[PDB]
Write a protein that binds this DNA or RNA. Structure first.
Ligand SMILES: [Zn+2]
Lengths: 122, 59, 121, 48, 117, 206, 46
RNA sequence: UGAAAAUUCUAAGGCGCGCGAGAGAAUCCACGUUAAGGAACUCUGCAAAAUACGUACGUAACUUCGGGAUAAGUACGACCU
RNA sequence: GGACGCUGUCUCAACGUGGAGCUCGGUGAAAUUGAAGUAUCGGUGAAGAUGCCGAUUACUUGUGGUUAGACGGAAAGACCC
RNA sequence: GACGGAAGGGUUUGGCACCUCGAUGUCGGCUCAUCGCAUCCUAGGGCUGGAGCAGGUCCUAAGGGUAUGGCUGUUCGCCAUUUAAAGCGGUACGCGAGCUGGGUUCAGAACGUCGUGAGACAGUUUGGUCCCUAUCUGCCACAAGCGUUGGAUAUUUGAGAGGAGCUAUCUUUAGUACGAGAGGACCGAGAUGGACGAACCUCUAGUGUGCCAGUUAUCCUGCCAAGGGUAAGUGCUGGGUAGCUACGUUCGGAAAGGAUAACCGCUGAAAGCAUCUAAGUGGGAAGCCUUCCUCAAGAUGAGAUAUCCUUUAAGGGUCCUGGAAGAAUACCAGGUUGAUAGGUUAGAAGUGUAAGUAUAGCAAUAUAUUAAGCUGACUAAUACUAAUUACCCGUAUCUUUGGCCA
């Protein structure tokens, strides 16, 4: 349940460490993003001398949320912080490695390469 | 929030007669004394109720 | 719409309702027969029958529970010794509430609550 | 006309009748039938 | 009696495993990927039981790569292959939600019961 | 249209073979009998009168009693409805629950839960005013009309008043399970009415 | 990509769109090879 | 209890506010709690929430050399021996 | 004006609590008021009609709510002359 | 499409001073809308200097939809990201007896300018009471009375009315038609969503001042032990069933048909040709009418039927026990032939191992007895208690005519 102004952990090695959601894409009054949705983020804090500067606007995919969402088989998975991964123009991960676990709705949202680069899929 | 014109006596009478209307309570004569008591209540005159004493009626 | 079924709230906050119930149950056990508003008596009997059925069996632990509600020692002993042993067999319905009419003055619905069988003397 | 065959003529007559309680009563005094047969055979109506 | 409960008993087909809140368990269950299934595993501490009847569920928490993860499993779900109790612990609550606030080593551990000899 | 008078037992969930959970509502079907028929040349239309769970013999009025005079061993029925344009049955018959065995979707009609005198914000999803910044306006209507034109409140303006209690028919409920021995139907989703209220289940239109 | 669902009837027959013509009307409708039941939208044949 | 006439409870003593009883719909005023986000509200962080004590550690720019300063920031506190 | 922390300010409202509100019994006002078997629309008119014209609609009478109108009530307009 | 020419709209800045100064409250924002079409999107077309994609212009079309933020009191505008689109207007520049008072338009004070001065300034800055219990109409809901031509009880046909009518991305057809290449479809299907609406509580989640446990301060039950009250309207914390609720679950926007708008026709004249029209006869859109859901015979035009009753009968009401219902009402279940409520028994569950005793420890405390004790708003059983040997309303009037029968 990421909305506008939400803070997120950038979970990849581009350089950013904190991002802020500034728009939820795909819908007119759309208000919440879930796992596997694409949002527009601004970078609020980054590793020094990186390829990503503080104050740039990118698109990112949500990989962990702190609010559980129902699955078909009845299981709910609820992480402990909200985290996203930056994307380039082709809607593919800009980074080369992903930190921590991700949720398996990326599988269905067709982010197979994010899933592969993740460490654990829950 | 104030009356605009004084209402007619017809309207006032109608409202008053409809609202100030009290309904009779139901009755049922006591099995003991024959008084007409309120249905489903202890008799206030003899104290019995379904042939059972519950009160001790005084003056 | 109304939730919280099981009370009447007796028109008063929780602590004062609890105190009201305790006092009226004490008086009821003391006097074998009381008169009051129908709603108050209804709740009183809901709790008095529960106390009697808990006191059907006399043990230290049961007595110490019943003290958490009955704070009059004399009436606690009376409940455990003189009242229940006559309802040892009855499966329920130890009390009897019977209506009395509308009271003059504020037109409350009065009623009388009493025990079906009077206890040992 | 298709939904209510008698509606056009009923509406026209209602418009041409006077207005008020007597006009409404006069319209009560009128029976309209779509077909060529009526149920008031007991009154021996005079043809016109 | 109840027709709801009879339908539930007719639809259980998968008895509940035995374990208690506070134990450390490993659950092995099935996951579909389109057309293929895989066996997946989850180690953690059971930190709650849940609702009435067949809707009963349980919650498992674990720490992965420094990030906390929780999963809710329906007890009678056919996807649950096995539940095995690695360590059995002694608690005093019925829900262990305070572990969400515990941090560090304390964030994942429960003192175990030691059965008398 | 095939229909039955059932009772909403409650809700539960079931596990499909591969693990997918389906939330279902359970309906219990007391025996339903055909009490009479309505005919186009005598009543103006064709329908079958269907009845359900019995009444207590002390509380059946004689009109209701005489309604069942010609039927053999059919006690008076408390819930009576009509199924328009149906055939294949006649007075004295009895409808199994299996008439839905070949049906994929159903429609259910019942009396929705009553919510009493309810305000605008619950009744019509009205937003309210702010709860701070000096506001003295929390869950009121706001404005209702315009100023001088039209100098009245239009008919149908939405205000406070009673909420729910109406009939409602919910469409295209998938049929999950049929159980003849316990006289039960399991549909997927919600069904109007409180527990123990009586619904009517019809074959879906689409 | 959840595998592209094969456009199949509930009776195992392929569903194909035809365009009937009748009295100034083009009609589009769905037809099942196995059972020849004509409907008009493959929704009604799954 | 405590540094204290603070705070809470209570003895002596004095009172239970000179309309009540049922029912708990909307709504009005005053409060309690809350998933996820944390000022996106709004003229304005208005209002609330939060901070709060004792004992230690550690405290800048600037300065009229007195201050700033309880700066900031952080630890310990129960029971038994 | 900005930042941290914190939060129902907000996304987005929900539930509970106390006093009113509701019903009954007792006591019992108020501003206001030419009266009244006081509907709507398109018009007309001292130029925004419950009262006029044409048409439409509407069984009689209460109660709990809501303020669009009666150019509502309150103060011989404070602005202007 | 210049230069000119002819109109409409009444929204902009104005003109006039006709209503109102014994008062018609003024800008924005909030809430709630309703209507117009001069159409922003979706729909149907004509022509293009329209290859395709994407447009340009014009016509028809108001069913639905028409973003969140930064700055400013702002409407407006700019800007940041979105989106199928971020429409233009009327309604006292909609809406203060619904809200806010930032702005404007009081008394304080300050700056600039003008004045010798008191002071002034459609110049600026800061601070600055937004009153009223609804009589009537209107509207949202619920009842009492009577009518519907004998009186009642169930089931319904339906005039009429309301609700709903949004749309995207991706995958096939097909990297095919088109085209130097770049690029890239119409038509028709499939899958998954956004927004909105409804129902519901199986799950997720919130509340849960019933309940259970931990603990602080103090008082009390004589004391130990064990408990109880008070720390508004829970002392503070950890949980929590039912009920309610969304953040949750499920479902809904259809398919088909009829008549049409712009448009395209066929056959054909007036006018030997030609011509969609003058006789005829066809296609043709989210629009109109049916279809879907809800209300509905006070539709006084008061309908239709099945059964009951025939001098107070059928039936209804009051009273009482209650609910799935509820402000009072009504509706619905029940009233001794009775499971309606309370109580009781048992269970689905909540809390999490009581008191007592024993053992271990100097003690705090731990272990055993023990899935304990306590609580069970729901579910089913069991007449023990309460619903009474009971009180009021309530039936073919007469005239004319036709059919059947005597
Ligand atoms: Zn008597």
């Amino acid at each position: 349940m990421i909305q506008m102004q939400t803070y997120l952990t950038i979970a990849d090695n581009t350089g950013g460490k904190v991002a802020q959601c500034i728009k939820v894409l795909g819908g007119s009054k759309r208000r919440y993003a879930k796992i596997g949705d694409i949002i527009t983020i601004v970078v609020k804090q980054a590793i020094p001398n990186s390829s990503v500067k503080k104050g740039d606007v990118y698109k990112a995919v949500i990989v962990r949320t702190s609010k559980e969402v129902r699955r078909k088989n009845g299981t709910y998975v609820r992480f402990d912080d909200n985290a996203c991964v930056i994307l380039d123009a082709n809607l593919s991960p800009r980074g080369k490695r992903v930190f921590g676990p991700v949720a398996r709705e990326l599988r269905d949202a067709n982010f197979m390469k994010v899933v592969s680069l993740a460490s654990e899929v829950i | 929030a104030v009356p605009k014109f004084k209402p007619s006596k017809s309207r006032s009478r109608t409202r008053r007669s409809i609202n100030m209307r009290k309904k009779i309570p139901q009755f049922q004569e006591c099995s003991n004394c024959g008084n007409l008591g309120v249905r489903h209540r202890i008799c206030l005159k003899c104290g019995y109720y379904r042939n059972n004493q519950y009160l001790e009626i005084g003056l | 719409m109304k939730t919280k079924l099981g009370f009447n709230r007796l028109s008063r906050k929780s602590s004062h309702r609890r105190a009201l119930l305790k006092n009226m149950v004490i008086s009821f056990f003391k006097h074998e027969k009381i008169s009051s508003t129908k709603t108050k008596l209804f709740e009183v009997k809901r709790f008095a029958e529960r106390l009697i059925t808990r006191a059907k069996v006399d043990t230290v632990h049961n007595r110490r529970e019943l003290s958490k509600f009955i704070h009059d020692k004399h009436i606690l002993n009376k409940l455990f010794t003189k009242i229940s042993p006559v309802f040892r067999q009855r499966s329920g319905g130890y009390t009897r509430m019977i209506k009395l009419g509308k009271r003059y003055g504020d037109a409350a619905e009065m009623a009388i609550l009493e025990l079906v069988e009077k206890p040992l003397k | 006309s298709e939904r209510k065959p008698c509606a056009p003529l009923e509406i026209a007559i209602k418009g041409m009748l006077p207005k008020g309680p007597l006009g409404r009563n006069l319209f009560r005094n009128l029976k309209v039938f779509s077909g060529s047969e009526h149920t008031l055979k007991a009154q021996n109506p005079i043809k016109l | 009696m109840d027709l709801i409960r009879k339908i539930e008993a007719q639809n259980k087909k998968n008895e509940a495993f035995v374990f208690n809140v506070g134990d450390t368990v490993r659950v092995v269950y099935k996951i579909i990927e389109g057309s293929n299934e895989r066996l997946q595993s989850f180690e953690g501490i059971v930190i709650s039981f849940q609702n009435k009847g067949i809707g009963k569920t349980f919650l498992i928490r674990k720490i992965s790569s420094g990030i906390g993860v929780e999963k809710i499993f329906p007890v009678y779900s056919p996807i649950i292959e096995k539940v095995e109790v690695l360590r059995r612990g002694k608690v005093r609550r019925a829900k262990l939600y305070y572990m969400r606030n515990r941090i560090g080593k304390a964030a994942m551990k429960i003192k175990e019961r030691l059965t008398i000899k | 249209m095939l229909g039955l008078i059932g009772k909403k037992v409650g809700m539960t969930q079931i596990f499909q073979k591969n693990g997918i959970v389906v939330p279902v509502t359970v309906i219990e079907f007391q025996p339903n009998y055909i009490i009479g028929k309505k005919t186009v040349d005598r009543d103006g239309y064709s329908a079958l009168i269907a009845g359900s769970v019995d009444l207590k013999s002390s509380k059946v009025s004689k009109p209701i009693k005489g309604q069942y005079k010609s039927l053999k061993d059919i006690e008076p029925k408390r819930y009576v409805i009509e199924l328009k344009g149906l055939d294949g049955y006649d007075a004295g018959d009895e409808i199994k629950v299996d008439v839905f065995k070949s049906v994929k979707y159903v429609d259910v009609t019942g009396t929705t839960k009553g919510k009493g005198f309810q305000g605008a914000m619950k009744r019509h999803n009205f937003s309210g005013g702010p709860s701070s910044h000096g506001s003295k306006f929390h869950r009121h209507l706001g404005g209702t009309g315009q100023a001088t034109t039209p100098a009245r409140t239009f008919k149908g303006t939405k205000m406070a008043g009673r909420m729910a209690g109406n009939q409602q028919t919910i469409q295209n409920l998938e049929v999950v399970l049929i159980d003849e021995e316990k006289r039960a139907l399991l549909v997927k989703g919600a069904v109007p009415g409180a527990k123990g209220s009586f619904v009517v289940v019809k074959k879906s239109k689409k | 990509r959840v595998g592209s669902k094969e456009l199949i009837s509930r009776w195992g027959g392929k569903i194909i769109m035809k365009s009937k013509f009748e009295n100034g009307k083009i009609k589009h409708y769905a037809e099942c090879q196995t059972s020849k039941n004509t409907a008009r939208k493959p929704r009604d044949l799954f």
